[PDB]
Each structure stands twice: as C-alpha cells, then as structure tokens.
Amino acid sequence: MKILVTGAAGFIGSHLCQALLKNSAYHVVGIDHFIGPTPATLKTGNIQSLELNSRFQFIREDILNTDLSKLLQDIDVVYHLAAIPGVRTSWGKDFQPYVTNNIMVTQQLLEACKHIKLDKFIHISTSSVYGEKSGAVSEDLLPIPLSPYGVTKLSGEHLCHVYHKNFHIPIVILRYFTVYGPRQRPDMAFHRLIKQMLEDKPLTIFGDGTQTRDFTYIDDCIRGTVAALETKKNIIGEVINIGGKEQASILDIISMLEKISGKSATKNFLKSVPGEPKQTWADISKASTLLQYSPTVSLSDGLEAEYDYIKQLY
Amino acid sequence: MKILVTGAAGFIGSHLCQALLKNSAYHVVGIDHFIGPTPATLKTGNIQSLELNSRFQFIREDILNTDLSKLLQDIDVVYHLAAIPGVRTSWGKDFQPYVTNNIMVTQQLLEACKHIKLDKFIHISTSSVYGEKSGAVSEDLLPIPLSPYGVTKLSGEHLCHVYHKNFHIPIVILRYFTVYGPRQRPDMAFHRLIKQMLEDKPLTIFGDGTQTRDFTYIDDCIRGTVAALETKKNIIGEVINIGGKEQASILDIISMLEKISGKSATKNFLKSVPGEPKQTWADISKASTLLQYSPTVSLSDGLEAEYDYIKQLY
Numbered sequence A, B: 001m002k003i004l005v006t007g008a009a010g011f012i013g014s015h016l017c018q019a020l021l022k023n024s025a026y027h028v029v030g031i032d033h034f035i036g037p038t039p040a041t042l043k044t045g046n047i048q049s050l051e052l053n054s055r056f057q058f059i060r061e062d063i064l065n066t067d068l069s070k071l072l073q074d075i076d077v078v079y080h081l082a083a084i085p086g087v088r089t090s091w092g093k094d095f096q097p098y099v100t101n102n103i104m105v106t107q108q109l110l111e112a113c114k115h116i117k118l119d120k121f122i123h124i125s126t127s128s129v130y131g132e133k134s135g136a137v138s139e140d141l142l143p144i145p146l147s148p149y150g151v152t153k154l155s156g157e158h159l160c161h162v163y164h165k166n167f168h169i170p171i172v173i174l175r176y177f178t179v180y181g182p183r184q185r186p187d188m189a190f191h192r193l194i195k196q197m198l199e200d201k202p203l204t205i206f207g208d209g210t211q212t213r214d215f216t217y218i219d220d221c222i223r224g225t226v227a228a229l230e231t232k233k234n235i236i237g238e239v240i241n242i243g244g245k246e247q248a249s250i251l252d253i254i255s256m257l258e259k260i261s262g263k264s265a266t267k268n269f270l271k272s273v274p275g276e277p278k279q280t281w282a283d284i285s286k287a288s289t290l291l292q293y294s295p296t297v298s299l300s301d302g303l304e305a306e307y308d309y310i311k312q313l314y
C-alpha cells in the first residue's frame, strides 16, 4: 500500500516513516515544509537515512501550496502529523501560524481526501486538548484547552469529525502525551535540559519543577501509531490516547539526568508558562483494548537514549 | 457605561445596539466591516437607524485593521457578535473567511482586552457547536460540531476560556439557537420562505422538511443578551444557551406561514445540506437561573412580525 505521512521530517514523523519502511510491502510519501521550532539542519539529519530508501519519496513543500491531487493519488493511508507545536509561542502575533498550519492545513487535506478511497486517515493530536484535568484522562472527557496551541489542535480533531460524518473520510484520532527520545525537538524539556547539562549551563525550570507529565518514549508512540494502521478491527471515528510507561516531575527527570551524567545540575527557576497544565496523565485502557498497546520503555532507558542522541548531535 | 458591539450592522448586533440605546446611561460604539452573506445595502439601513441616536458611534473598519488598544481605553463591556455565519457555505475554498473572522478576530480582540479594565466580555456563540443529540442540550455536553462553521465558532469559545483562565478576561459565552424576526439575514430560512410565499414562488426546502429548530425570536434573544450585562448573578466563565419559546420543523413553519399569508404554497424539496443538524433543542435551565431568561414571543406572533418586515422590505 502507499502511505502519505505529513510532517515526515519532524521528530515523530521521521521515526514513523522509518518504522513503516521496515515492511517491504509499504511505500511511503513524506511531505514536510521544514517549519516550526526545529532548525532545518536537524530535520535534514532526521531524513538522511529515509532519503536513501527507494520506497520513500520526499516532498519539501507547504501542504497549503502543494498539488493535493498529485499528493493523494493512489494513497491508501494518510498519517497527518504536520503541525506547529509549542505552548509559549502560541500567544499574540505568534498565533497566526498555528491557525494556518493546524486548522487550514487539516481542512485542505480532508477536502482533498473526499473523492480518494482511503483505508484510514490517521490524525495525530495532543493531550494539550484536555487542558487542566485531575486523574488519568479518558477520551470521553470534555476537552477545555489551556493554550492557543491546544485550541488549534482541538479544531483539527473537530474538522476530522466533520469530514468523517459528512463525507465518510475514515478518520482515527491519536492523542499523544509528551513524546521524548532521539530526535526530540529542541524546544522540548528533555532536549533543552540535556543540552544545558552537557554544556554545564543552568537547567531552565518553568515554575517550581513539580509539574508532571505522562512521558511517552518515541518507540512506544510509534508502536501504537503503526498498530492503528495494522489493526483489522473497525476503529474508524475513534479517539485513542497514546501514553507512556512512567509519569514523572521535571525535578524527578533532572535527578535521573544527574545519575546518567554523574554531574550536578545548576538549576534556574523561571516564571510558570501561561497555558501549561500542572499535570498530564493518560488513561490508555482504550489503546490497550483496540490496538493491544502497551508501553515498555522505562524513563531510565529512554533518557539514556535521548542523552546519547543529544551528546552526539552537538 | 460605554459598550463596544462588534458586528453592529448585522442582524442581531443592530437589534442589540437598538436595545442598549433605550437606556440613557449607555453609550454604544458599533464596529462593522460590512462582510459576510448580507449585502451592504441592508446593513447601511441598520447603521442609519442607530445613528439617529447621539449616544451611538459607528466605526466602519475590519477588527483586524483597527487600533484595538485605543478603541478599548474607555470601554466597560464588549459584546462580540462579529463573525461569518452560515452552516451551509463553510466548505472548501469558502472556509478561510470563517477562520479569519471567527478565530483570528476573536483571538486579536481577546489579546487587546488583556490589560483593559472590562466589567464583561460577552462572546456570542451558536447551537452549531453541539451537532446532534436526542433531547434538549445542556451547556456541559461534549460538543462535536457537524459543520466547519460550527468548528470555527467552538474554537472562538475555547479562545475565550484560554484568555479567561490565563489573563482573567471576564468572559461570558451565550450560545444562540436559530434567531429570527425583522432584519433576519436574507440567507436564513424564514426570510427566504416568506419572500418566496409573498412572490407566489416555490418554497425551497433543503431535505424532507422534518429538520427542527429551537427558533428564538429576536426580542427574546436580545432580552437574554441584555440580561447578561444587567443580571444580579455572577456569570463570569459561564456558557449559557439562549433558546426559543417553541420548537418546530420547517413543514410546521410553512403551515404557520400559510395561516398568516392566507395562501396555499408550492413546495420545492431539494437535497439536504451537509453540515446541518436534524434537530436543535436548548436546555435553558441555566439561563432561567442566571439571567431570569424566559422567552415570551410565540412562533405565530414572531413569524407575523417577520412577515410584515419582509413584505415592507421588498
């Protein structure tokens, strides 16, 4: 089958392409405009192995300018990961690119899929739609985003439901929870903190560091994401959380990094970022039931993998 | 008290300004860009009736091209009605104006209101955020829009929540259910059916006519809207349905119009429109508690008042 992966040069997209191309029966088309927080130099590094594979076609174009008829021709499955991520930079004049790349891109892809015969349109969304919630969050919970980023991602999901119900586009929504590992974007906490610790520079903590996340190792995320394509059971119209093995605070993470490096971190405590929840915590019962999803990578192992990646990168 | 009304030249905004100007204490500033489905000659008449009153100031500008800081310095209350409406015409290349005027306009107003001292930011939303449910919908129900229009309006609501929680903007959300009466937009059902019945033409019905609406007479909508300003209760942060006295199907409305005109009408049944709900039905429990809201205008009285307006308009 032929699979389109949007945002194929990004953190998660590049890994997903690599995992799909392990199946010799799969051909992948990747499209990426090299925008968002990650410098082009890092994205080039993300796709260098992919571009050698004869079953990978790479298109460096904006989805809003590209020929979507040409892009979607004989596509069987769409993985839509293209987006602008980032809570802090989603305020004031920085908001327009979130609207353009998270809302308009999703509408224009879904429009182009109306007369195509897809098996699946697998739309990647975020735990950021939930906002500030207590306990493990299930997919039937009323989302109240806390950031403009989260609002634009939730509008994407809502467009998926619109095109599903009206035009029978076979949508599946995955909500990822803070993904980390090799190739993590340089604006995310583990990349920043590891880079800072390697350079013997202060570790930047937003707020007091007691905030927690459901951190999801990249190989766990990708196993869940591939399972959504490979299942034969009807998951069309479903929203599925994809979460991690072990939750932790930023202080817990820094302690674990200090154990890996054998260094002691200098900490700088900055003001809390408006729009960030204090806690995220997935209920992954539904992914367990529908996808046989079970995350298996510990934080200690995942963090050493990212630590090694960042050290080698710089 | 000085009140900014966005979309002041429109159907509901012109009525809202009219009602506020009846209170000598209130100074009103209307802003309208003359865009959306209604031709600018009908909106000229709206602004002309308001401009009779010395306590009314009109600004003919796009909200995205105005010095909002300067405009808002002396504003106590914002009523935000400016939007592109239209469930039916929000598809394909028509979608971008919905995103620009329903999402970016809301974000930019909220941004300008961050450091203003406002009593209240009263944001007007729509039953179109809900999509499809069995009985009367509560404001706490998980909304899944059926139309791109609905997605854009729900994104505006979510932007209100984000700015309320992060910057303490005193937001109130009103979800209107299909508003009708004198000055109703020409693209809405009652305007079209009345005009068609007056001109002895086939009544155009999109689907089988068994669609039903919680039709809200304009004077009832405006009484609940003014009560959001004047209520003794604390409603900051609340979402409040504003619905009508009597629910009816389009077939039911046609029989009531036949009663009023003293004519038998010719029906033209057309294709159902994608993105429209089959039923809308507000639970107005919350408006009754928080706003003392009770709709008083029957369909027979309201349709007669709209009939008289349409007969005079052409």
Ligand SMILES: NC(=O)c1ccc[n+]([C@@H]2O[C@H](COP(=O)([O-])OP(=O)(O)OC[C@H]3O[C@@H](n4cnc5c(N)ncnc54)[C@H](O)[C@@H]3O)[C@@H](O)[C@H]2O)c1
Pocket: A006, A007, A008, A009, A010, A011, A012, A013, A031, A032, A033, A034, A035, A036, A037, A038, A043, A061, A062, A063, A064, A080, A081, A082, A083, A084, A085, A101, A105, A124, A125, A126, A127, A153, A175, A176, A177, A178, A179, A180, A185
């Ligand atoms: N990384 C996480 O922790 C996380 C958590 C939740 C959800 N997500 C979601 O997962 C997806 C992937 O995230 P990521 O961390 O890999 O981000 P990323 O920035 O590394 O990758 C996304 C890619 O999308 C591309 N893109 C954006 N707009 C485009 C457009 N108009 N045309 C073409 N390409 C465009 C960018 O160039 C970028 O390489 C996103 O949808 C994000 O919202 C990620």
Ligand SMILES: NC(=O)c1ccc[n+]([C@@H]2O[C@H](COP(=O)([O-])OP(=O)(O)OC[C@H]3O[C@@H](n4cnc5c(N)ncnc54)[C@H](O)[C@@H]3O)[C@@H](O)[C@H]2O)c1
Pocket: B006, B007, B008, B009, B010, B011, B012, B013, B031, B032, B033, B034, B035, B036, B037, B038, B043, B061, B062, B063, B064, B080, B081, B082, B083, B084, B085, B101, B105, B124, B125, B126, B127, B153, B175, B176, B177, B178, B179, B180, B185
């Ligand atoms: N009429 C209904 O039945 C109904 C039902 C539910 C909700 N609503 C909501 O009520 C509000 C008013 O609806 P209406 O029927 O009076 O519509 P309308 O089109 O008559 O009025 C809206 C006005 O907003 C103005 N506007 C749009 N974008 C603008 C911008 N960028 N700058 C300045 N002005 C701008 C337009 O020129 C227009 O006059 C809208 O928010 C709509 O979503 C209406």
Ligand SMILES: O=c1ccn([C@@H]2O[C@H](COP(=O)(O)OP(=O)(O)O)[C@@H](O)[C@H]2O)c(=O)[nH]1
Pocket: A087, A178, A187, A188, A189, A190, A192, A193, A204, A205, A206, A207, A209, A211, A213, A250, A273, A276
């Ligand atoms: O340099 C940093 C970057 C992020 N964070 C915090 O680390 C957490 C995780 O952020 P990350 O960017 O990993 O993922 P997010 O949860 O935003 O998707 C958030 O609470 C941020 O407040 C931090 O303390 N220092």
Ligand SMILES: O=c1ccn([C@@H]2O[C@H](COP(=O)(O)OP(=O)(O)O)[C@@H](O)[C@H]2O)c(=O)[nH]1
Pocket: B087, B178, B179, B187, B188, B189, B190, B192, B193, B204, B205, B206, B207, B211, B212, B213, B250, B273, B276
């Ligand atoms: O000429 C028309 C216009 C509208 N409608 C239908 O009338 C209902 C009410 O549409 P209106 O525009 O009044 O309000 P909406 O509910 O879209 O805000 C919808 O089911 C439309 O499909 C119709 O049958 N004929």
